[PDB]
Amino acid sequence: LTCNSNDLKALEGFMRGLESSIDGWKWNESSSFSSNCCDWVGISCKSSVSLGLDDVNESGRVVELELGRRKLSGKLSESVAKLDQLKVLNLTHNSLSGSIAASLLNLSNLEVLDLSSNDFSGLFPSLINLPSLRVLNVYENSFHGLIPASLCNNLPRIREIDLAMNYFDGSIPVGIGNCSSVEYLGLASNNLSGSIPQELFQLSNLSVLALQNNRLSGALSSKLGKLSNLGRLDISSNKFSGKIPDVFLELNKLWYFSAQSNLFNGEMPRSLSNSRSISLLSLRNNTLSGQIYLNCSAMTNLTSLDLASNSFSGSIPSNLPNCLRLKTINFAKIKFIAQIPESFKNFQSLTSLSFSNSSIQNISSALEILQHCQNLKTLVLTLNFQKEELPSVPSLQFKNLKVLIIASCQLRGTVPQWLSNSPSLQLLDLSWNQLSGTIPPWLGSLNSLFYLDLSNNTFIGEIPHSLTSLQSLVSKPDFPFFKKGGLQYNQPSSFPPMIDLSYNSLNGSIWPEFGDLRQLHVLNLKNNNLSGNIPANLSGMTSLEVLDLSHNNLSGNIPPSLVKLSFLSTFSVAYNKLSGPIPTGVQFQTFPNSSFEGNQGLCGEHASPC
């Protein structure tokens, strides 16, 4: 109940190290807060008698200091090591900088040390005596040089070690094998190089191992089969090489394996094709070759399978619909030059499929097959079927489809009616095709659609009024997408809401009612026949980041009300019939002179004086 005096003096030292005051602590001494550190917020006391301290005084001792997310700036004072009964030290997600005193790695009672997400830098202390420590987390700091070679010599009770997101360098220390009790080891996002020391495979309680994003090299030795309790392994973004060892019968708990973006080659080992455990499998962006083979009788846990961007040859495996839990497939950038097997009509587990840039052919049968997969949510056909004809058959139905992208195929035909059988469409990309006709007004009735890309086609006619009324533009496991370097979008909600009709033949004017779409981030009308006045009411699109009207026939004035778009970063009226003063609002003054070019009668700032 009553703060120990030495503990209080240690906490007072910690306090000066900081550049700002912690609320819930009596700080300045003009503070009206309690002088008893035990009622300070983030501090937990235990009786001296419960800690087995039999001495003359009965006082509260500080066993937990938990300051996570308190917005702390300063150093970490050495005097924190004066608190000898400390069990938990949690400083996570703060601004603290400086080095870590060796003193603090000497505390005998310490159980959790969590320093993560700070500015700590310099070398990590080489002397670790922390015989009570379950958890050591330095994730996300500025530490550099070697991981301590002696790291585990004094950590007999250790459970989680996380060094990830630092500058640590060198080979993983041969002493990493003395970590015997460890379950979690994060090394990812560092400078580590050389081979994996054979001694890593002696850690028999190892459960999760994160090695991704380093320079690790050499083969991946068969000794991996020694870690039989391993459930999750990320080897991604290193440079390893050679065949993948055929150990997967030995790792019977392994549910997660990610080797992507390495130099691996040869065929996938037989045992991996047989794993009864693996759930997520990502091999993408390696040199793997041969005919893809999975025993879907053996593979009863498979859910995410990602082979994209590999050297595979032969046929699309026709037995994959026999993997009963399999949900997502990224087959992108494997060049099959075949069509989709008839048997995919039975894939009822599949929610997401990408054949992007896989040289698939006969789109007519592709859609006829794929409509029978009831659970299809995401379908990416980009860069296939080149020059074929986008089926106009009314019969096709994808009921559950959220995302449809068939882009850059040079497809011919019109926007087909069958697409209306997907009332839940959020995202539609038909861009970069030979598609013709008029954009059908029924698109307006899609109540979930927030992203529409019709760009770089032959469409003609007017923009339909109904787009003005799209419900989701009026008001408000993993399958990465990349947008043409390409930026990565993790799910559909990551794309700014968009209407991109750019690069077509559309005639007509721009409807005033666009001002009703308050959730629209991007409007791209560039490169069309659009004529008439830019409506003042565009001012009402409050969320609009990008407004591109360039290369059209538009006449009249840029409406001064466009100053009310405060989020508008990027804008072009270039090459139109436009005339009059350019709006002087703040966003406009930051637009480049090229945004207004090719309009003779435009004047004011950005042009010749009116």
């Binding site: 961007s309 990416v380 980009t382 861009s431 043409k484």
Partner: peptide, 5 residues
Amino acid sequence: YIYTQ
């Protein structure tokens, strides 16, 4: 256009 890889 959107693609995956």
